[PDB]
Design a protein around this nucleic acid. Structure first.
Ligand SMILES: [Zn+2]
Ligand SMILES: [Zn+2]
Ligand SMILES: [Zn+2]
Ligand SMILES: [Zn+2]
Ligand SMILES: [Zn+2]
Lengths: 618, 187, 586, 200
RNA sequence: UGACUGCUCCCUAGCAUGCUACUACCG
RNA sequence: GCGGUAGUAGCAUGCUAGGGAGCAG
C-alpha cells in the first residue's frame, strides 16, 4: 500500500524486467533475472546460471517466453495514438485488423415473416446484430487502460475486510497437486505468444513429461518468469458498437497456474448452497433452489442489484493483490512462507503487469485484469464480495450514534470502531459476530461481478446496511468510476424474483401442482441468434439442426409469459424445426430412392421434451 | 481361429460323428457323437474366444505406441525450431553498444525498458493526424530520446510510399492517416 | 525414433541394445540377429524389459506381452502374448519387411569386438552400409578403449620440456607419442577450463606440445574423446566413366612443367574418382596445382587426413597459382593461415576432415590415403558434393593408428575402400616420374611392392650403406630400449665426420630420447613423418618387432634421405634381398 | 458432386488412378473399375485405410467401418465390402443406369496417347468422351513437355552464343520452334524475369 | 490472428455392472 | 428336476474417451 503511493514520483522507464548478460557455450544472451514491481519493490531471481554448456528443453521454454530477447532484438517505437508506455516493435510494419459483418439467413427470415412476425408496432423487435468494425480499432480499444489511475487503498479497514472475506471463503479446501492429476478440457485451443507459431497447447502438453512439468512448477516457486500476452478482436453478437477484446496468456503461465489453483478452483464449482454460485445449473430446477437460498431469513426483504462500469479495466492494483492473496490462503502446509510470496510475485508479473502485444508491437499494461488466465472468474467474485463488505462497513460507521434505537447495533458499532482504528491484530470473536450479523441482514448471491442482494428494509432505511448511495460513494472514492443510478434496479416486491441477473428475467409460474421460478431470456436475443450466423456454421438449416434444438431449449419458459408474442417465438421455433426435419427427409429421399424407416425423432417438435428440462429430478 | 490346435481334433470328431450318423449305429454311439461334439465345442470354448481378445489388445498397444512415436518426433521438431529461432534472432543485438552500456551498471543489471531506448538503430513513429505530425516529425530530420534521428521513408495504412513534399495542410484529407515514419540514428 | 534398417532399408522402430552403436533393425533381420548372439536386448519407443516393480529379467523371449506393459512369467497376467512368435519380433510395420539372407556377416561385425586382423578383414568384406557401420563401431570402441587410462595429474613443475607428473589410481599409463595427444583441462573451483594440447614423452615427462601454457599444481591430462556421430552419406558415390566431359571445360592453354599429369587430367574429366598410384614423393605435391591451371574453371578441393600433412597441398598454392581464389578453415589447431578462414564459397578450398563445412564443388583432391579409413572418406563425401574427385597416395604406407591390432598384423590392401580398389579394381593411374630419389630405391620398390612400375631415375651416388648386425631388444612399459644400438650409434658414425647433420629414425622414440643425451640430434617419429625430411637421415632399427618389421614401415623410410642414409637391416625381415656396401662392426 | 459423364446422374466419385479424374456414377464407375487397372477412386475423401499408419491403396482392399475406412490388414471384425453387388459404395447409390458399353471409356481413359490407335479411339467415341479425350491429350502433352531438364545457362559469350547446361540426368529436348522456352532468374531465393527465347 | 472457467443437448466408441433370452458341461 | 460353470445374442444403467453445437460472465 505504501509502495503504491511512493512509486508515483519515479520515472516510468525504470520498471519492468531486469536483464543481465550471461554466456552459454561461449555465446552471449540476454535474460530476465528479476523484476521491479510497482508494489512489491525489487525482487531478485535466485537460480540463474552465469555459465552453461548446453540447454535441454525447459530452459528453452523459459528463455523463449521472456520479453527480454525480443525487446532487445527490436526497433524503438514512439506511438502517438495512445498515452500507454510503448516498449518496442518486432516486425517492420504494424498490422491492421478488421472484423467482418454478419452473414444473413434469409430462409429463416422469410419463414418468420410468413408467420406474421416483425409487424410495425409489435412488441418484439430485432436489437442484437453482428456489428462490424473498422481498421485501427484494436489499439483504440486497448487505449481504454487510461482509466486506471494508481490508487492507494485505505489500509486499516482493508486489513479487516480481508478477514471478513476470508471468513466468507471458509468451507472450501485447496492445496497444491502433483502434475499427473491436473484436468484440462478442450486441449486444442491457442497458447499465447510466441508458442502459437508451431502448434496449439496439445503439442506442448504432450511433448512435456510429468517430471518436466514438476520441475517447471517447482522452478517458478523460487524464480520469476515475465511473459508476453496477445490481444484479439472477438466475433460475437452484441447490443453496442464498442468492440470486445480477449487476451490469450502464454502457455508457461497457465501450465503452472493450473497446478497451483486447481484444487480450490474445482472445490468451489462443486458445492451447492453458498454465497458463490459458479457452477450451479440453471436447468433441472436450479434457479428455484438458488432463489430460495437467497431468501434465507431476511425480515422485510427488498431486492438490490448493482453493476460496476468498466469492471475489468478500472481495477486498482491493491484489490487484485488482495484477491490473489485471499485465493492463495489455503496453502497452510503444502508450501513454505517464501514460496507463497514468490508464487504471488509470479502471478503479479504474469497477469497484472504484463507486456501486452496489442497489434504488432509491445506495450506496457498499467493494471487491470487480463481476462485470459485461469483465475479471473473467481478473483472478480472475491473483489465483488470485498466491495460489498467495505461499502457495508462504511455505511455502518458513518451514522450518528445518538439516534440509533437498539442497544445491540450501537454496541456493535462501538466495537467496530475499536477493532478498526485501535487494535492491531485480528479479533476472531468480533469478526464472527459481525459476519453472522451480515449474513442475517445482508444475504448475498454472487457471480463474477453480477450480484443480487436480499437486504433488510427497515434497517437500510435508517442507514445500518448500505442501501445504494454508500455503494456509489465507495465506488467513487475507491475505484475511480461513477456508478450512475440508472443501471441499478430495485424491487419492492418479492413474489417476482430479481429484475435481471445474468441477463435472465425471472418469472414465477405454476407447474405441476406448486409454483417455481423459471428464467427466460430476452426474445430479441433469441431471434437475433437465429437470424444472424457466421458462414456455413448454419447459413441454412438442413446441415446443422442441433443449433435450433439448443436454442429452443433455452427459450422454452417464454411460453408462460402473459404477453402473447413471447410464446409465439417458441412456437415459431418449434414449427421451423419440424419443417427442417421433414424437408431433410424429403431431400435425401428424392435424390435417393429410399429414406428413414425408424426415427423416434418425433419428440423434437413437441413441448413434451423441452418441458422435461425444468423439473427437479436428475 | 482357423488353424488352432483343437481345430483338427474338432474336424476328426465331426467326421466320425457324421460317419456314425450315416451308419445309424447303437444308441451308445449316438451318445458318443452327442458328447464328443459337445467337447469339440468345449475345446473352442477358449480357442475362438481368447485370441479374439489377444488381437484386440495387441492392436491397442500398437496404435498407442504409434501415437507415442508421433509425439516424440514432434517434440524434436519443436525443439529444433525454437533453438534455431533463438540463434538466428540473437545476432540482431549489435553487440557494441549493449556491451558498452551494461558495463556502466553497478553489477551488470539494467531495466529492460531502456535497451531499445539507446541501442536501437531504427526508430518507428506512428502519427494519428497532421496537427500531431507537426510537433514531432518536423522537417526532414528530428530529435527525440536524447539523440538525432533522420527520416528515410514515409508510408500510410495501405503500405505505399509517399514523399514528404505531399504532407501539407490541404493535402492531408487525401491520405489514409495512420502515417508510419521510419528513421535511423545519426552520428 | 523411426528410420530405415541396415540390411533391408525397410522402415521399423527397433534397436539392438547390445551393440555399441545401436543400429535400426528390420523386424525379420532383427529376429535373425537376436536369435544367434548374446544380444538379448532390444529397444523401441520403450525398452523391452519387465518393468514390474523390483524385477530385473532382461531378455526378449523371457517376456510376455500383457496389458499396456511387458512382463515375464513372474508378473504376467493370465491374458498375455508372447513377443517372440512366428519367428519374428513384434514391432512396428509388421507387414512391410523383406529380411536378408545375409545375417552371418552382420553377426560377425557385431560380435567381433575389434580385437584381431580378422576384424578389419570383416570390416572390409561387407556391404557399403555394413562397412560404414563397422567404421563407426571401430571409432566408438577405440574411443572407449583409449579413454581407459589414467588422468595425468601434474602436482609440481620443475621446468619446461619435462614435468613432475602422476596419474589416477590403478589405471594404466597410455603409450608415448603423437597418436596420444593430450588436450587436458583444469579446475578453478567448480569445473574444467583451458590447459592446452600436448604429447607426453619420457625424459621427468617431456611434453612435445604444439601450444604453450604456464602449468601449475594439480594440472591433469587425458586423451579427450568426442561424440562420433553416425555417417549419413556413403563413403563414395558409384562411378561411371562419362561419355563426354561435362561440367569441366577442356582448356587449350597449358603449362607443361608437369608432363605426366595432363594425360591423367583429361581422363579424370571423364571419371568420378581417380587415385594415382604414386611412389613416395613422385611430385605428388604438384598434381592438383597442375589441374588448377589446366582447368581453371572448376572448384578444386584440397584436403588431407591430417592438419600437419596438408603441408604439401597448402604450400605451392600461393607460389604458383593466384592468391585470391583460395581459402582454408582453421578451428579454434594452429596451422597455415596464409589463406582466408571462414570463406566457404571459394574456387580453391584447403582443409582437414575435422573442420570443413558442407559445401558443393566440381573437383576434389585428397592426399595421404594410406592412413585413411572408410570413416574419413565418408565424412568428406558427406560434407561436399562434386562432379569429379582425385585421390593422391598409395596403400603401401604406414596405416592409421590401428591400436586394436594385437594379434597378427593387418595386410596392405585390406586398409580401406581405395586401397583395395587400387589392387582389385585396377590402378586408375600409375607413376615412375619420381624426380626425388636415385636408382637404388626406385628399383628396390619396383621389384619389392610397387609392381615394377618405376624406371632408373638418376645417378646412384652410392651414399647408402647397409650392415650385418645383431642387436638385442628390451622393453620398459610400451617402448623399447636398445643400448647395443645406442652406443654403436656413435661407434657407427665413426668413419667420416659428415653423417650427424641428419635426423634420427626409431620406432619407439624413447631410444631417440636416450641417444639425444649423447648426441642431441633431432628426434623423428616414423608414424607421422611423411613429407617432412632432410636430404640425409639416420635410420636405427632399435627393434625386431612387426611394429617396425612389417613389409612397408621401412619401405618409405629408406627413401627419406636423398642419396645417403643408414640402412641397417639388422632385423631378419627383408635384409637378405638387397645388395649394398657393408663393413664389419668395429 | 455433379452428374456423371455416361449417365447424367448425380455422383461423388472421381477415378483417382485415371488422368483427369472424371465424374462417374456408382454403376458406371464399377464398370470402369472392374475391367482396367483403375485401382484408385476418389470421393469427398480418398479411399485408403485411415487406421493409424496404414499402407494400402487399392479400392477393393478397403472395407467400410464407422466414420473410418479400413483395410483387410487393419480392419476390425465389423467389416463392409465397398465393392459389392456390382456397384461401389458412394453417394446416390440408387439413381444410376449405367451401360455395359464401357470398353470405349475403358480404353480411352487408360489410353496413353502413344499410338495411332489412340487417336483413332479418340475419333471413335461419344461427344463427352471426345471432350475427355481432348483434355487428356492436353494433359499428356503437358506431362510430356516437362520430361527434360532445365536449360541452365552458366556463362555468357557473344550474342547468339551462350554457355548452356541442364539439370541432373534428364534427356535432350526438342529444339525446333514448337516450344517457346521461358526461364526465370533468381536473386537468392525466388525465380523472376528471364523472358522467352527460342534455342537452336 | 481465435483466451479462461461453468452448465446443457446430440452422435459414436470402450469398459464395468446389472437384467434377460439360447445351445453345451457338472452334481 | 434343481443348482453352479463356460460360450453367442438382445436390453438397461453408470463411468470414461472422442467429435460437433448453443447460452452466461
Ligand atoms: Zn502450495
Ligand atoms: Zn546387435
Ligand atoms: Zn518380471
Ligand atoms: Zn454413370
Ligand atoms: Zn488399411
Amino acid at each position: 500500500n505504501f509502495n503504491v503511493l511512493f512509486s508515483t514520483v519515479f520515472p516510468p522507464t525504470s520498471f519492468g524486467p531486469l536483464v543481465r548478460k550471461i554466456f552459454v557455450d561461449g555465446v552471449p544472451f540476454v535474460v530476465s533475472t528479476g523484476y521491479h514491481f510497482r508494489e512489491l519493490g525489487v525482487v531478485h531471481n535466485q537460480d540463474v546460471n552465469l555459465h552453461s554448456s548446453r540447454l535441454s528443453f525447459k530452459e528453452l521454454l523459459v528463455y523463449a517466453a521472456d520479453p527480454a530477447m525480443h525487446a532487445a532484438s527490436g526497433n524503438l517505437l514512439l506511438d502517438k495514438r495512445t498515452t500507454c508506455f510503448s516498449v518496442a516493435a518486432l516486425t517492420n510494419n504494424v498490422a491492421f485488423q478488421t472484423v467482418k459483418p454478419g452473414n444473413f439467413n434469409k430462409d429463416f427470415y422469410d419463414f418468420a415473416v410468413s408467420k406474421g412476425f416483425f409487424k410495425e408496432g409489435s412488441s418484439v423487435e430485432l436489437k442484437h446484430f453482428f456489428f462490424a468494425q473498422d481498421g485501427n480499432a484494436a489499439i483504440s480499444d486497448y487505449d481504454y487502460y487510461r482509466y486506471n489511475l494508481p490508487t492507494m487503498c485505505d489500509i486499516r479497514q482493508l486489513l479487516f475486510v480481508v478477514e471478513v472475506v476470508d471468513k466468507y471463503f471458509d468451507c472450501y479446501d485447496g492445496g497444491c497437486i502433483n502434475a499427473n492429476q491436473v484436468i484440462v478440457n478442450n486441449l486444442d485451443k491457442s497458447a499465447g505468444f510466441p508458442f502459437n507459431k508451431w502448434g496449439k497447447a496439445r503439442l506442448y502438453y504432450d511433448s512435456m513429461s510429468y517430471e518436466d512439468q514438476d520441475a517447471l512448477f517447482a522452478y517458478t516457486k523460487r524464480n520469476v518468469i515475465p511473459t508476453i500476452t496477445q490481444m484479439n478482436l472477438k466475433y460475437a453478437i452484441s447490443a453496442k458498437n464498442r468492440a470486445r477484446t480477449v487476451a490469450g496468456v502464454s502457455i508457461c503461465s497457465t501450465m503452472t497456474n493450473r497446478q497451483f489453483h486447481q484444487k480450490l478452483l474445482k472445490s468451489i464449482a462443486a458445492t451447492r448452497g453458498a454465497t458463490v454460485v459458479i457452477g450451479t445449473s440453471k436447468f433441472y430446477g436450479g434457479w428455484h433452489n438458488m432463489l430460495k437460498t437467497v431468501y434465507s431469513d431476511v425480515e422485510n426483504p427488498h431486492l438490490m442489484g448493482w453493476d460496476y462500469p468498466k469492471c475489468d479495466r478500472a481495477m486498482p492494483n491493491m484489490l487484485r493483490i488482495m484477491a490473489s492473496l485471499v485465493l492463495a490462503r489455503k496453502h497452510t502446509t503444502c508450501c513454505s512462507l517464501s514460496h507463497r510470496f514468490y508464487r504471488l510475485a509470479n502471478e503479479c508479473a504474469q497477469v497484472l503487469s504484463e507486456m501486452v502485444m496489442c497489434g504488432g508491437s509491445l506495450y506496457v499494461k498499467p493494471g487491470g485484469t487480463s481476462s485470459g488466465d485461469a483465475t479471473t472468474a473467481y478473483a472478480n467474485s472475491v473483489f465483488n464480495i470485498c466491495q460489498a463488505v467495505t461499502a457495508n462497513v462504511n455505511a455502518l460507521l458513518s451514522t450518528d450514534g445518538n439516534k440509533i434505537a437498539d442497544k445491540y447495533v450501537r454496541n456493535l458499532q462501538h466495537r467496530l470502531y475499536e477493532c478498526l482504528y485501535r487494535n492491531r491484530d485480528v479479533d476472531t470473536d468480533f469478526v464472527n459476530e459481525f459476519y453472522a450479523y451480515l449474513r442475517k441482514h445482508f444475504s448475498m448471491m454472487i457471480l463474477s461481478d453480477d450480484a443480487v442482494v436480499c437486504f433488510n428494509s427497515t434497517y437500510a432505511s435508517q442507514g445500518l446496511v448500505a442501501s445504494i448511495k454508500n455503494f456509489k460513494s465507495v465506488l467513487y472514492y475507491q475505484n475511480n468510476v461513477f456508478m450512475s443510478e440508472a443501471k441499478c434496479w430495485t424491487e419492492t416486491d418479492l413474489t417476482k424474483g430479481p429484475h435481471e441477473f445474468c441477463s435472465q428475467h425471472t418469472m414465477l409460474v405454476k407447474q405441476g401442482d406448486d409454483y417455481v421460478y423459471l428464467p427466460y431470456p430476452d426474445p430479441s436475443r433469441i431471434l437475433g441468434a437465429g437470424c444472424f450466423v457466421d458462414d456455413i456454421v448454419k447459413t441454412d438449416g438442413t446441415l446443422m439442426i442441433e443449433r435450433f434444438v439448443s436454442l429452443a431449449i433455452d427459450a422454452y419458459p417464454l411460453t408462460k409469459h402473459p404477453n402473447q408474442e413471447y410464446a409465439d417465438v417458441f412456437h415459431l421455433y418449434l414449427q421451423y424445426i419440424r419443417k427442417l426435419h421433414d424437408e431433410l427427409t424429403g431431400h435425401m429421399l428424392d435424390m435417393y430412392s429410399v429414406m428413414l424407416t425408424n426415427d423416434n425423432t418425433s419428440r423434437y417438435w413437441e413441448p413434451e421434451f423441452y418441458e422435461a428440462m425444468y423439473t427437479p429430478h436428475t | 481361429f482357423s488353424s488352432l490346435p483343437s481345430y483338427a481334433a474338432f474336424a476328426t470328431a465331426q467326421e466320425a460323428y457324421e460317419q456314425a450318423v450315416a451308419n445309424g449305429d447303437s444308441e451308445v454311439v449316438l451318445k458318443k457323437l452327442k458328447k464328443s461334439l459337445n467337447v469339440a465345442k468345449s475345446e473352442f470354448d477358449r480357442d475362438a474366444a481368447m485370441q479374439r481378445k489377444l488381437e484386440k489388445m495387441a492392436d491397442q498397444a500398437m496404435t498407442q505406441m504409434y501415437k507415442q512415436a508421433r509425439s516424440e518426433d514432434k517434440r524434436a521438431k519443436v525443439t529444433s525450431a525454437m533453438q534455431t529461432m533463438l540463434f538466428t534472432m540473437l545476432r540482431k543485438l549489435d553487440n557494441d553498444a549493449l556491451n558498452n552500456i551494461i558495463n556502466n551498471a553497478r553489477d551488470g543489471c539494467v531495466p529492460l525498458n531502456i535497451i531499445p531506448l539507446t541501442t536501437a538503430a531504427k526508430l518507428m513513429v506512428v502519427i494519428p493526424d497532421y496537427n500531431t505530425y507537426k510537433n514531432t516529425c518536423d522537417g526532414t530530420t528530428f530529435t527525440y530520446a536524447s539523440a538525432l534521428w533522420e527520416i528515410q521513408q514515409v508510408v500510410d495504412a495501405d503500405s505505399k510510399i509517399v514523399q514528404l513534399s505531399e504532407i501539407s495542410m490541404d493535402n492531408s484529407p487525401n491520405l489514409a492517416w495512420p502515417l508510419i515514419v521510419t528513421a535511423l540514428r545519426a552520428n | 525414433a523411426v528410420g530405415a534398417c541396415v540390411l533391408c532399408n525397410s522402415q521399423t522402430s527397433l534397436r539392438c541394445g547390445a551393440c555399441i552403436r545401436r543400429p535400426f533393425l528390420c523386424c525379420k533381420c532383427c529376429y535373425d540377429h537376436v536369435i544367434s548372439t548374446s544380444h538379448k536386448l532390444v529397444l523401441s519407443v520403450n525398452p523391452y524389459v519387465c518393468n514390474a516393480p523390483g524385477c530385473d529379467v532382461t531378455d526378449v523371449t523371457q517376456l510376455y506381452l500383457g496389458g499396456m506393459s511387458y512382463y515375464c512369467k513372474s508378473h504376467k497376467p493370465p491374458i498375455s502374448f508372447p513377443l517372440c512368435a512366428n519367428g519374428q519380433v513384434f514391432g512396428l510395420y509388421k507387414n512391410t519387411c523383406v529380411g536378408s539372407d545375409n545375417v552371418t556377416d552382420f553377426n560377425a561385425i557385431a560380435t567381433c569386438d575389434w580385437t584381431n586382423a580378422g576384424d578389419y578383414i570383416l570390416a572390409n568384406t561387407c556391404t557399403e552400409r555394413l562397412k560404414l557401420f563397422a567404421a563407426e563401431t571401430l571409432k566408438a570402441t577405440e574411443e572407449t578403449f583409449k579413454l581407459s587410462y589414467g588422468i595425468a595429474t601434474v602436482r609440481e613443475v620443475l621446468s619446461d620440456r619435462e614435468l613432475h607428473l602422476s596419474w589416477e589410481v590403478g589405471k594404466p599409463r597410455p603409450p608415448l607419442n603423437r597418436n596420444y595427444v593430450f588436450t587436458g583441462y583444469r579446475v578453478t573451483k567448480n569445473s574444467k577450463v583451458q590447459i592446452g594440447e600436448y604429447t607426453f614423452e619420457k625424459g621427468a615427462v617431456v611434453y612435445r606440445g604444439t601450444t604453450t601454457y604456464k602449468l601449475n599444481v594439480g594440472d591433469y591430462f587425458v586423451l579427450t574423446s568426442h561424440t562420433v556421430m553416425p555417417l549419413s552419406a556413403p563413403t563414395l558415390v558409384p562411378q561411371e566413366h562419362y561419355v563426354r566431359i561435362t561440367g569441366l571445360y577442356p582448356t587449350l592453354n597449358i603449362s607443361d612443367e608437369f608432363s605426366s599429369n595432363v594425360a591423367n587430367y583429361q581422363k579424370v574429366g571423364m571419371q568420378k574418382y581417380s587415385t594415382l598410384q604414386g611412389p613416395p614423393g613422385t611430385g605428388k605435391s604438384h598434381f592438383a596445382i597442375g589441374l588448377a591451371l589446366y582447368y581453371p574453371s572448376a572448384r578444386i578441393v584440397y584436403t588431407a587426413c591430417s592438419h600437419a600433412a596438408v603441408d604439401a597441398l597448402c604450400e605451392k598454392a600461393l607460389k604458383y597459382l593466384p592468391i585470391d581464389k583460395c581459402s582454408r578453415i582453421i578451428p579454434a589447431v594452429e596451422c597455415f593461415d596464409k589463406f582466408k578462414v571462414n570463406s566457404t564459397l571459394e574456387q580453391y578450398v584447403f582443409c582437414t576432415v575435422n573442420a570443413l563445412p558442407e559445401t558443393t564443388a566440381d573437383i576434389v583432391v585428397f592426399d595421404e590415403i594410406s592412413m585413411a579409413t572408410n570413416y574419413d572418406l565418408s565424412v568428406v563425401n558427406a560434407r561436399l558434393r562434386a562432379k569429379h574427385y582425385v585421390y593422391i597416395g598409395d596403400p603401401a604406407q604406414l596405416p592409421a593408428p590401428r591400436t586394436l591390432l594385437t594379434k597378427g598384423t593387418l595386410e596392405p590392401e585390406y586398409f580401406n575402400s581405395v586401397c583395395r580398389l587400387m589392387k582389385t579394381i585396377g590402378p586408375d593411374m600409375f607413376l615412375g616420374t619420381c624426380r626425388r630419389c636415385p636408382a637404388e630405391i626406385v628399383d628396390t620398390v619396383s621389384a619389392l611392392v610397387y609392381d615394377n612400375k618405376l624406371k632408373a631415375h638418376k645417378d646412384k651416388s652410392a651414399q647408402c650403406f647397409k650392415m650385418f648386425y645383431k642387436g638385442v631388444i628390451t622393453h620398459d612399459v610400451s617402448s623399447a630400449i636398445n643400448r647395443p644400438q645406442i652406443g654403436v650409434v656413435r661407434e657407427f658414425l665413426t668413419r667420416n665426420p659428415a653423417w650427424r647433420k641428419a635426423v634420427f629414425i626409431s620406432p619407439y622414440n624413447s631410444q631417440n630420447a636416450v641417444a639425444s643425451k649423447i648426441l642431441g640430434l633431432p628426434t623423428q617419429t616414423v608414424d607421422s613423418s611423411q613429407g617432412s625430411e632432410y636430404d640425409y637421415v639416420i635410420f636405427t632399427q632399435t627393434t625386431e618387432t612387426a611394429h617396425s618389421c612389417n613389409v612397408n614401415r621401412f619401405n618409405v623410410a629408406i627413401t627419406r634421405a636423398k642419396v645417403g642414409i643408414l640402412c641397417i637391416m639388422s632385423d631378419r625381415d627383408l635384409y637378405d634381398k638387397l645388395q649394398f656396401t657393408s663393413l664389419e662392426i668395429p
